[PDB]
Amino acid sequence: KDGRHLNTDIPPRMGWLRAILRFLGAGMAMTATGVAVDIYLEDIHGGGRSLGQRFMTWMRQE
Amino acid sequence: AHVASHGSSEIQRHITEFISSWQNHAQ
């Protein structure tokens, strides 16, 4: 909500990560009881570039 | 101390390896 935290920078390459971050966002907005709330991205600890390298390691490991 | 101890992800590795490498400058 306050702009771009510079930690959540998905590269122009590997833009498939957005479609998984949608599910990871919409998980907790449905698990929490009560009103489904508008949910905003806050932090990716290892960086957005190094986040999807873990997914690519899982894809090589199958 | 833990608040300030967490202080571009590739430039951080570049500056860490920049700092960690050097030290110096019979009759």
Cα A20–chain centre separation: 7
Helix A48-61 / helix A17-31 crossing angle, nearest 10 deg: 100
Task: Give the minimum alpha-carbon distance from B9 to chain A in angstroms, rounded to a whole number.
Answer: 7
Resolution in A: 3.4
The experimental technique behind this entry is cryo-EM
The chain B residue lying nearest A48, using CA atoms, is B9
Chain A residues with CB under 8 Å of B10 CB are 49
Write down the residue that tokens 């590739």 correspond to: B10
Which contacts (CB < 8 Å, 24+ apart) does range A43-52 have?
A43/A5, A43/A7, A43/A8, A44/A7, A44/A8, A45/A7, A46/B9, A47/A7, A47/A9, A47/B9, A48/A7, A48/A8, A48/A9, A48/A10, A48/A11, A48/A17, A49/A9, A49/A11, A49/B9, A49/B10, A50/B9, A51/A17, A52/A14, A52/A17
